[PDB]
């Protein structure tokens, strides 16, 4: 019932423990976190946005290693955040300033960081089915993708222009 939504709030603190597990064997545990969140996105209001703010702290620890199989499975976790955006205040736009500035550091990397933005392009497709400086910082990811396999993050730059 509503205890399962409180179990999602308690699992966001368990995802904050997975942020400590992503600091260090635990890379296959992030691949299990993607398949379990994909079924939890098929399973699905301010505590759920705070669980996405606790997932923004989990995205801050995941931006440090952007191994490569965990970042490729993070695309399956970002496609789960797209279906979690297909399930439906100013702290969620602060999470967009941490994920767009980490895309400029992701320009040094390899295809798994572009796969995480290709599935986050479906999160922009699901937010359209449902703060402007983060889209201008997402327009910096357009110069990071189209300057140099190059069409994967370029299609994500078309959904980042919205």
> Is residue 98 packed enough to be buried (19+ CB in 10 Å), middle (13-18) or exposed (0-12)?
middle
Determination technique used: cryo-EM
Among 71, 85, 88, 78, which Cα is nearest to 117's? 78
**First-to-last CA distance in the chain?**
36
3-state helix, strand, coil in the chain (%, to 5): 80, 0, 20
Whether the Cβ atoms of residue 129 and residue 88 lie closer than 8 Å to each other: no
CA dihedral sign, ordered 41, 29, 14, 134: negative
Displacement of CA 112 from its chain's centroid (Å): 12
Question: What whole-number distance in Å separates Cα of residue 117 and Cα of residue 119?
Answer: 5
* Residue 26: HSE in the Cβ half-sphere, 13 Å Cα cutoff: 11
Counting beta carbons within 10 angstroms of the beta carbon of residue 57, is it exposed (0 to 12), middle (13 to 18) or buried (19 or more)? middle
Give the residue among 58, 116, 128 at the shortest CA–CA distance from 88: 128
Alpha-carbon torsion (32, 34, 40, 42), positive or negative? negative
């Amino acid at each position: 019932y509503f205890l399962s939504a409180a179990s999602r709030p308690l699992c966001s603190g368990g995802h904050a423990s997975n942020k400590e597990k992503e600091m260090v064997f635990c890379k296959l545990g992030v691949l299990v976190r993607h398949r379990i969140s994909l079924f939890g996105n098929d399973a699905t209001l301010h505590i759920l946005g705070q669980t996405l703010d606790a997932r923004t702290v989990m995205k801050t620890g995941l931006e440090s290693v952007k191994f490569l199989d965990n970042a490729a499975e993070d695309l399956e976790k970002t496609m789960e955040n797209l279906k979690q955006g297909q399930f439906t205040t100013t702290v969620a736009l602060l999470p967009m300033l941490s994920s767009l500035f980490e895309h400029i550091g992701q320009h040094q990397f390899l295809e798994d960081v572009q796969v995480s933005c290709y599935r986050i392009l479906t999160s922009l497709y699901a937010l359209g089915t449902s703060v402007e400086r983060q889209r201008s910082a997402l327009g910096e990811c357009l110069a990071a993708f189209a300057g140099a396999a190059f069409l994967e993050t370029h299609l994500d730059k078309h959904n980042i222009y919205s």
